[PDB]
Amino acid sequence: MRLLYLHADRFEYKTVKPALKNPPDPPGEASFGEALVVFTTVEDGDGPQTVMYAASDIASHSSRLKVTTVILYPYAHLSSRLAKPMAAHKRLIELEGALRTKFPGHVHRAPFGWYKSFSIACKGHPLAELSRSFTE
Amino acid sequence: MRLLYLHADRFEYKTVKPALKNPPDPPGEASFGEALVVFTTVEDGDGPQTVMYAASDIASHSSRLKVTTVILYPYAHLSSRLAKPMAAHKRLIELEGALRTKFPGHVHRAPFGWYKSFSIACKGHPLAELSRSFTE
Ligand SMILES: Nc1ncnc2c1ncn2[C@@H]1O[C@H](CO)[C@@H](NC(=O)[C@@H](N)CO)[C@H]1O
Ligand SMILES: Nc1ncnc2c1ncn2[C@@H]1O[C@H](CO)[C@@H](NC(=O)[C@@H](N)CO)[C@H]1O
Ligand SMILES: [Mg+2]
Ligand SMILES: [Mg+2]
């Protein structure tokens, strides 16, 4: 699993066209104030152990930033070892569920299988942009 | 070299604190309208051949999107095989120079060695977010 953590002042997205024949989540749009935005690329080897490590890490980082909103944003572009779309969707559902057991704030999982527009205002402090890898 | 291509309606950044002992570029800030924003991670094996392939690709993609501004945005977070900071800075200067020989619009290389805030409004069409690898 490859993640990018962006500490945002604000974030919003809108699904536009479908990117899979039948996107497994409905279309939608949402906007947020301050948040940790986690761009999340699910990889071929990812399983339950991977999901739990990433959930732990996201919670730990969120705590250190003092953020109370996490956005789990599915993202196909951070890796060249992608899991197939249905497995990736399952692992993202699992990550959202695991994160809720470790982090007390708002957890928003953005819809999977859509092309999306987005806007982000990313903070510029030293911990505002980090990347992470998890495996098992 | 690992790149992320984001087709933006607007982009802006500001250097904040230095991220290297002596950043090789001055502090600064800039904002743009529609542009191709290229987050660029220089990797250990990158040399002149790599730079030329990436410059060709960026020009080709820009043409297909009908964009007339490219932002070359140094980014440490897209790879786990980073070139050292001074080599990365040299390859980014080279990429900017090579791109000008292939693409006729505005080429802006953002300062290297700074933590930066940024804001982007990324389009949501099917070619608005792509990633690329180059090697030699
Ligand atoms: N292995 C994987 N890891 C994470 N997300 C994955 C994935 N495989 C498919 N997706 C999702 O399907 C959309 C089309 O690739 C993806 N959409 C996107 O990546 C948008 N940000 C493009 O605008 C994403 O929702
Ligand atoms: N191998 C490499 N490829 C691309 N850029 C590289 C690099 N090694 C160092 N940098 C630059 O040094 C700043 C601190 O890592 C980096 N700064 C950043 O990546 C900001 N976006 C953080 O706010 C970047 O300017
Ligand atoms: Mg809509
Ligand atoms: Mg300033």
From Swiss-Prot, chains A, B:
It is found in: Cytoplasm. Keywords: Cytoplasm, Protein biosynthesis, RNA-binding, tRNA-binding. The keyword Glycosyltransferase does not apply. Changing residue 129 to A: Whole protein and isolated domain have nearly wild-type deacylation of mischarged L-seryl-tRNA(Thr), no activity on L-threonyl-tRNA(Thr). Same results. GO terms for biological process: threonyl-tRNA aminoacylation. Its main location: cytoplasm. It comes from the Archaea. GO terms for molecular function: aminoacyl-tRNA deacylase activity; ATP binding; threonine-tRNA ligase activity; tRNA binding; zinc ion binding. Belongs to the class-II aminoacyl-tRNA synthetase family. Archaea-specific ThrRS editing domain subfamily. Freestanding tRNA editing subunit of threonine--tRNA ligase, the catalytic subunit is probably AC Q9YDW0. Deacylates (edits) mischarged L-seryl-tRNA(Thr) in trans; has no activity on correctly charged L-threonyl-tRNA(Thr). Probably does not aminoacylate tRNA(Thr). Deacylates correctly charged glycyl-tRNA(Gly), but not glycyl-tRNA(Gly)(2'-dA76) (the terminal 2'-OH of tRNA adenine 76 has been dehydroxylated) nor the 2'-fluoro tRNA derivative, strongly suggesting the editing function is catalyzed by the 2'-OH of A76 of tRNA(Thr). Probably interacts with its catalytic subunit. There are two ThrRS in this archaeon. The first one (APE_0809.1, AC Q9YDW0) is most similar to bacterial ThrRS but it lacks the N-terminal editing domain. The second one (APE_0117.1, this entry) is most similar to archaeal ThrRS but lacks the central catalytic domain; it probably does not aminoacylate tRNA(Thr). The N-terminal domain (about residues 1-140) is an archaea-specific tRNA-editing domain that has a highly similar structure to Dtd (D-aminoacyl-tRNA deacylase). Editing of incorrectly charged L-seryl-tRNA(Thr) by this domain is tRNA catalyzed. This is Threonine--tRNA ligase editing subunit. It comes from Aeropyrum pernix (strain ATCC 700893 / DSM 11879 / JCM 9820 / NBRC 100138 / K1). The gene is thrS2.
